[PDB]
Amino acid sequence: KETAAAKFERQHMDSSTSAASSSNYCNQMMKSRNLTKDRCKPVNTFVHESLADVQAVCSQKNVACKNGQTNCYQSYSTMSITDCRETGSSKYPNCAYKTTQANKHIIVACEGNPYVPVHFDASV
Template sequence: MAQERFCILFPPLVLVLLVLGCVQPSLAKESQAEKFLRQHMDPDTSTVTPDYCKQMMKRRNMTVGYCKPKNTFIHEPLPDVQVVCFEGTVRCEKGKLNCHKSTSKMRITYCHLKKGSKYPNCDYETQQLQKSIVVACECRQYETVHFDGFV
């Protein structure tokens, strides 16, 4: 009887523990997945102006205290980016093995700090591209947590 009850309750318990492992323990701190969304996702953009990077880097808090040297914004729906976690595994720039490369090209904007630009006047070059992206995924590939590059 006790063994039957254990067999019934054990699978849901394991599932709950796996889900809790993906949840950020501190509500005040931005999770890696939330940071990815803030720093890299801009799916509703149909047009990108020459000032896009300067405006977005400031709006998304990437020029607070210093000028982030480079950043990439992805202009695709979030589900299209999340599905990359189930595509080809590749080695990340820093050697980890949780990166995945998209099989299709995506609309992105690459922002890089203009030469001579210094904090607090962060000025960026804006470059629109169509490239395959490489992202890192965690929690059994349910969350996109890092933009690793484009190819």
Template sequence: MALKSLVLFSLMVLVLLVLAGARPSWPKFENDHMDPGNGPFSPNYCNKEMENRNISGKLFNTFVHQPVEAVQAVCLEPNITCKNGQNNCHKSRSPMSITECIREKGPSDYNTINKRRHIVIACEGNPLLPVHYDGSEEVSSEAR
């Protein structure tokens, strides 16, 4: 009886590990790119956020300043081709407030640039969730 329980427990753990590995990386996307706070942000914003989120050292990063639900809803927009050629990207219908962080000199020396742009994100899973920030596009002059 104990052997049967051990085998069932081992199988259950294996299934859970497989399922966990197949889940989209929404928590990573949320950590790396989501900040629903209101901007514009000070010149030190990127230095502070990149350090606090343990992602300093990246050459470039973007934070999106919209509610989580609004960013997740972008996954419901029509599919477009990502920069890497995959067809799982989606472009926001409306411009969103973003902050681009561009590394200048050292690993914690970022230039902070506040913008309003359409975001492009890759989405995966069921339900679809953002897993990669692919870039942004300028707001066309007639939409301003």
């Protein structure tokens, strides 16, 4: 089975490029990272920072997760990200996305030993 931590890297980590280079990006990346398999996943975010920078967030600002748990962490600095958001006309299996680059703080849920990101909660 895929670990939660590896799933986070697959769904949210793209260190290779520093900033989007779009409008292709979300369409190819959602596809290539297996996020258009079961459904068109409506929203997803990719983080354009080193794995180490993102992992470090687990020891930064402790905040409440959206689901009411306490194991979420907000990055002290903003990070280069890309929000992928399905279009109104997107129909499975041909999943269509709008690519939006931004620099924002990320919020991630962390667990396990080692204590690493396992879910992307939000950006702010």
